[PDB]
Design a protein around this nucleic acid. Structure first.
Ligand SMILES: [K+]
Ligand SMILES: [K+]
Ligand SMILES: [K+]
Ligand SMILES: [K+]
Ligand SMILES: [Mg+2]
Ligand SMILES: [Mg+2]
Ligand SMILES: [Mg+2]
Ligand SMILES: [Mg+2]
Ligand SMILES: [Mg+2]
Ligand SMILES: [Mg+2]
Ligand SMILES: [Mg+2]
Ligand SMILES: [Mg+2]
Ligand SMILES: [Mg+2]
Length: 46
RNA sequence: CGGGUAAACGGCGGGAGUAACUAUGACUCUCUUAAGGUAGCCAAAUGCCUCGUCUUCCAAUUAGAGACGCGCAUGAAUGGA
RNA sequence: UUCGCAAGAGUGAAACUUAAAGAAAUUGACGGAAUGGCACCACAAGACGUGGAGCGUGCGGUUUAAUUUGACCAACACGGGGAACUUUACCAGAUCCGGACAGGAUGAGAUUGACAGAUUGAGUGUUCUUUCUCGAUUCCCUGAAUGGUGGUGCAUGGCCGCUUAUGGUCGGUGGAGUGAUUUGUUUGGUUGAUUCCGUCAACGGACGAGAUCCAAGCUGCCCAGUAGAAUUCAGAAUUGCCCAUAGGAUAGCGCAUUCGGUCGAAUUCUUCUCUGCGGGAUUCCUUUGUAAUUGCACAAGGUGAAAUUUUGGGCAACAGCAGGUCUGUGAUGCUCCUCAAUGUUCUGGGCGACACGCGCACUACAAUGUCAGUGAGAACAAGAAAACGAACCUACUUGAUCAAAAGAGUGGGGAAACCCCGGAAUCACAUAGACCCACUUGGGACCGAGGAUUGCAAUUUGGUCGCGCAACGAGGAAUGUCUCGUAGGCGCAGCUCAUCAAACUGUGCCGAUUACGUCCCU
RNA sequence: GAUUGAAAAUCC
RNA sequence: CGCGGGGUGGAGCAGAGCUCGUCGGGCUCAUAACCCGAAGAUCGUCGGUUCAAAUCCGGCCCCCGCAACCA
RNA sequence: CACCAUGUUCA
């Protein structure tokens, strides 16, 4: 069958991405997205 | 020239491989003869090697006996046992 | 120990070994036993092969990172298995969770996604730097869950193959047995047939066989504006004396033939065609046949479109098989993996790599041929699209003031309407055509240069010019299939399918030899 | 290792 | 010591030949038997001589022998 | 009346 013979890795284990927490980011802030529906995170507009 | 006859005189093979450990080899090839030694028997008054090897006999055995047998070169009225 | 010349005879243990050894019946199975049948998956008589060559494909080895795997008569163009990606199950990587749900640790920052720069094979937030954006959807770890073309077809379902193409199979009640078991289900004839007839310790049944069924013939009703015909009125074309190159043969002797564009009108009809139900064949009829000496039948001939299961199919009892399939499935039991996954996606490679062996194909070895013309001619079929047409198939034109392969345009067809009057290839030709017995204008293996086209991808597939000096001149031992519209030859369609049939499932075309037997072989 | 239903054998 | 003899496909053997073996394909459910095919020895060795050498002739190197005597 | 041998162990 598909034996789990395991695998040797030539690279380090890439970490799981974690969202950066900006406590009270609203207090810190600023340009409003010009895009009608919307760097602008919503439209990725640079 | 063609037959017969060995209780006529006499004669009576070699090499190579092979079993689920290893040996050795039932087995198989191959060369060969007139026939390739049968039954027996043996280091025998017959064996070179040889004071063969094992057992037995002695404190000690190139001796004796019983085995064994690749028998220089045992063997059937050249009579064998 | 006794006896014997001997050979031996008489007497006669044990140690140790071992779960059976035997005996008679029954049912199978087997026989280089007998008997009667039967089958070109057997043979006889044949016919076309195969095995020899090139090439396609499958299988095995060899190799490889991986060259995924099943299967070994009844595996080997089989898995509908013609794999560019996908498929794909294999290999080198890289994503996602598609871990529901419950309990924790969080938390209106739980979270989600990201531009750029580099990470990388990746103008892959994949992860990072970096800030944005999303918002209770999700994270975290604990059990759990889930998926798997993971395993095991020797755990199974279902299906298929095979036994097993033949005539087989099983109760009941009665009879016979101590019983397993037997009789019915017997033998004789008959038959493809456990098909009938006769017989009968059986008598009644049930299933297979046959019947039914679906196509091919022949025919009745129906039927046509998705099928045809024949007339009649026009419109037209040829029109007579006509003798090839050398020009044979082969009907014609009120009213000469032609013209699916002449897109002609009119009228009538169903010869062909369409097709739902009908019919038709039953050994029916006939032998101073065979048989019978009741029968059941049979052989010839007749009649007929068809004359014996009319023909080709389908269906097919009862037992089996550790046959195949856990790679068809939300068929599954038990197991294995499960978040750097045996899940899932994406990228690159493999499934097609070669010295070889084998199965099955396709093309050859030329003259009953090969080129190059002309002619006449089938059938089976398939066609376009979700949450107004467009994809699909076509004809015709053009490209064309100039190869093919293309590429355009314009129409038509949802398919008895278009394709289509379906110009299939075998085939024909008195074509006064080329070649002339050679591996050659036979044969195309294999390779070079250009260009097209399918496709996301061609490092696919046509077409053109080279190459041919690749074998191969008919194939040893062997060995397949086949009896009439058959073998063989020849095309065509469907299918898989973006592209690609030496495959298969159908279909028409042209059309033989032989046998009409037999148990030698199997 | 393959093989097998397990072994043996064989190859590997 | 002398005196001889003989050295060849993997094997046993001729003078490359034969037999067996080997390898490929049949035949078999398979194996053997069998059938059809393929390969495998410049011949102890070396040198000379010969057109040319397994051969001829030497020299070696083995094997096998046969003799190896006579108060 | 030519020849015509054999099938590892359990299951
Ligand atoms: K006595
Ligand atoms: K006695
Ligand atoms: K024989
Ligand atoms: K034996
Ligand atoms: Mg003797
Ligand atoms: Mg002696
Ligand atoms: Mg003494
Ligand atoms: Mg003595
Ligand atoms: Mg002696
Ligand atoms: Mg003597
Ligand atoms: Mg299996
Ligand atoms: Mg099985
Ligand atoms: Mg196929």
């Amino acid at each position: 069958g598909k034996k789990k013979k395991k695998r040797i890795f030539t690279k380090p284990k890439k970490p799981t991405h974690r969202h950066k927490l900006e406590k009270m980011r609203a207090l810190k802030y600023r340009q409003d997205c010009p895009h009608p529906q919307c760097y602008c995170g919503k439209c990725h507009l640079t």
